[PDB]
Design a binder for this molecule. Structure first.
Ligand SMILES: OC[C@H]1O[C@@](CO)(O[C@H]2O[C@H](CO)[C@@H](O)[C@H](O)[C@H]2O)[C@@H](O)[C@@H]1O
Ligand SMILES: OC[C@H]1O[C@@](CO)(O[C@H]2O[C@H](CO)[C@@H](O)[C@H](O)[C@H]2O)[C@@H](O)[C@@H]1O
Ligand SMILES: [Mg+2]
Length: 580
DNA sequence: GCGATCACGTAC
DNA sequence: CGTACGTGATCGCA
């Protein structure tokens, strides 16, 4: 049953046809400056395996790789493109990426290897990577015979599956989504990851020292107030101290013991001085372990840069995710944690950080899709949407909106986008279910178009079996027909939320593509560093700021044309923190 | 030693 | 109430 192929000792002409399935294997999960363990090529002339030392040193092979007219079909081309960038080799001509294709066809499948994608089309003549390389401590590259056949079988699957995947994408009217959006974005993300973000490690280290001091102080204060010492980090010793020794009330229970969520502690604060200290302790600890020590662990000691990896084929809504490190969840809400951003700086002298963010893109997308007259008019007037919502649901003039009213109207706006729920809104605003229901009821009275949309999108999900975004991304919702209330309700919220979060993802992704095209046309040195769902972070020479102030927001605002305007705010400074 | 499950907290 | 990722803890296991 073995698959035939040539284990070549040198590169030949027929290995360089203008159409081929290409495998450039990088086994390390984090592919930055990682080894390429083997190469496989399958084309009209046959199947070939090349040793990387040989192939990557061959002028003709390297030229073929960089020739845009020589088309390649691959799986996770970004992984290969980045691994090659670290070796000074350009990868061009990737016309089909099976990972991205499978992702667009059904993100729920969680396709993360060629075998998983192949199974979608009843093709099983290829092993899962885990089966070949093992996992964890036992992970390892097998001997050449085993490795070579696996890479050839993967290239063979890609070669065979391209047509069936493209045909289904076309039927789904997602072919342009793959070819004009996700694949071009893949190359942009590769450049971003490869460029990396410079880190002021000395500043982080100083913060770490100061935190260590405060942590020690607070820690001592906690033992003092508790009358003894214990591991504050343990959800058992703390449970005993709080709810047993100190007799604090048990307002919420996890599943295995006492719950100590920040929300639970906030309520217990009035009863004992130890509570506030525990909260403070955790927040400092969160900064220290995750944003100081954790960040320092992944900074490259030679360049002092962190090279995140944007997973482009993971989220069920079309958003990207970020890992090692996650640069999409850096503190900003609280000043103490916000200071962490002072550590992210430009990669060159006299360059600055430029950050642009969409203003309420999700609610603007909702206004567009629901065609709600009131919500559209609000954005056409560019009103403070939370104040406007408060005015409508509480029936008062702008001058009469109090801070608490705006705060609650804001929580309603979030609930509406997430997939409204009286129970969910109740928990969030610490109020009763009927009280939350009253708010929701008032909201729909003020925005009947939104109510219509929520009712209709749910019915549509049931009829078609899936919901779609502006650019045709889709999410299947089988649980929408479940006879279990909780399971069905979750699917209904997904039906309501996915077209919104997903369409916002579509828009910023297109904005990134348009932006890069503009930066190149203008020959600006400015380049993208990060994307955080509704914001783009760039770095550029100080001399380019004025041009960026006009170019970036315009490109982002014009990415798509909706029934309401899109608005983009921007700021720039010496550090990410200052780009406020 | 190791890997998986928790409970938690940070982002948009 | 939507979407993610990384942490320290606790705990069963080749
Ligand atoms: O290269 C990213 C790409 O690979 C997948 C598997 O096909 O994820 C791998 O790489 C990620 C980045 O290092 C890891 O977080 C993940 O654990 C590893 O399996 C895809 O999910 C992704 O699109
Ligand atoms: O009361 C109707 C109202 O309930 C929702 C859930 O919020 O859907 C329920 O009723 C529908 C029939 O009209 C079913 O298709 C659906 O499965 C059930 O949960 C709303 O969508 C609807 O407007
Ligand atoms: Mg914003």
């Amino acid at each position: 049953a073995k698959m035939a192929f040539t284990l070549a000792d040198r590169v030949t002409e027929e290995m360089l046809a203008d159409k081929a399935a290409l495998v450039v294997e990088v086994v390390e999960e984090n592919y930055h400056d990682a080894p390429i363990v083997g190469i496989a090529v399958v084309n009209e002339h046959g199947r070939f395996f090349l040793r990387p030392e040989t192939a990557l040193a061959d002028p003709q092979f390297v030229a073929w790789l960089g020739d845009e007219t020589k088309k390649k079909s691959m799986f996770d081309s970004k992984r290969a493109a980045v691994a090659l960038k670290w070796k000074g080799i350009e990868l061009c001509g990737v016309s089909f990426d099976l990972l991205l294709a499978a992702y667009l066809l059904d993100p729920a499948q969680g396709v993360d290897d060629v075998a998983a994608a192949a199974k979608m089309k009843q093709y099983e003549a290829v092993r899962p990577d885990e089966a070949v390389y093992g996992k964890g401590a036992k992970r390892a590259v097998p001997d050449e015979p085993v490795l070579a056949e696996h890479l050839v079988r993967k290239a063979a699957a890609i070669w065979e599956l391209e047509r069936p995947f493209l045909d289904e994408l076309r039927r789904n009217e997602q072919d342009r989504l793959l070819v004009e959006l996700e694949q071009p974005l893949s190359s942009i993300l590769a450049e971003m990851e490869f460029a990396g973000v410079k880190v002021d490690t000395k500043r982080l280290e100083q913060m770490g020292k100061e935190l260590a001091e405060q942590l020690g102080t607070v820690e001592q204060r906690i033992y003092e107030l508790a009358g003894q010492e214990f591991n504050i980090n343990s959800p058992k010793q703390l449970g005993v101290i709080l709810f047993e020794k100190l007799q604090l009330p048990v307002l919420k229970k996890t599943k295995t013991g006492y719950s100590t969520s920040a929300d639970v502690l906030e309520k217990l604060a009035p009863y004992h001085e130890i509570v506030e200290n525990i909260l403070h302790y955790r927040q400092l600890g969160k900064l220290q372990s995750t944003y100081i020590e954790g960040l320092l662990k992944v900074v490259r000691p030679d360049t002092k840069k962190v090279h995140t990896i944007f997973n482009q084929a993971l989220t069920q809504t079309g958003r990207l995710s970020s890992t090692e490190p996650n640069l999409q969840n850096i503190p900003i809400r609280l000043e103490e944690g916000r200071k962490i951003r002072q550590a992210f700086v430009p990669s060159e002298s006299d360059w600055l950080i430029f950050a642009a963010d969409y203003s309420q893109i999700e609610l603007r997308v909702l206004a567009h899709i629901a065609e709600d007259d009131n919500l559209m008019e609000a954005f056409r007037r560019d009103l403070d949407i939370h104040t406007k919502t408060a005015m409508d649901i509480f029936q008062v003039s702008e001058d009469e909106v109090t801070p608490n009213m705006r705060r609650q109207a804001k929580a309603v706006n979030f609930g509406i986008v997430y997939g409204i729920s009286d129970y969910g809104l109740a928990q969030n605003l610490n109020i009763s279910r009927k009280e939350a229901a009253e708010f929701i009821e008032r909201y729909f009275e003020s925005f009947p178009g939104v109510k219509r949309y929520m009712e209709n999108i749910v019915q549509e999900a049931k009829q078609k079996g899936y919901v779609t975004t502006l650019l045709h991304r889709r999410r299947y919702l089988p649980d929408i027909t479940s006879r279990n209330f909780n399971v069905r309700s979750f699917a209904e919220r997904m039906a309501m939320n996915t077209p919104i979060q997903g369409s916002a993802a579509d828009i910023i992704k297109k904005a990134m593509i348009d932006l890069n095209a503009r930066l190149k046309e203008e020959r600006l040195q400015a380049h993208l560093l990060l994307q955080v769902h509704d914001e783009l972070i760039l770095e550029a020479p100080k001399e380019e700021m004025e041009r960026l102030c006009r170019l970036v927001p315009e490109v982002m605002e014009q990415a798509v044309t909706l029934r309401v305007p899109l608005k983009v705010d921007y700021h720039y400074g010496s550090t990410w923190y200052d780009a406020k």
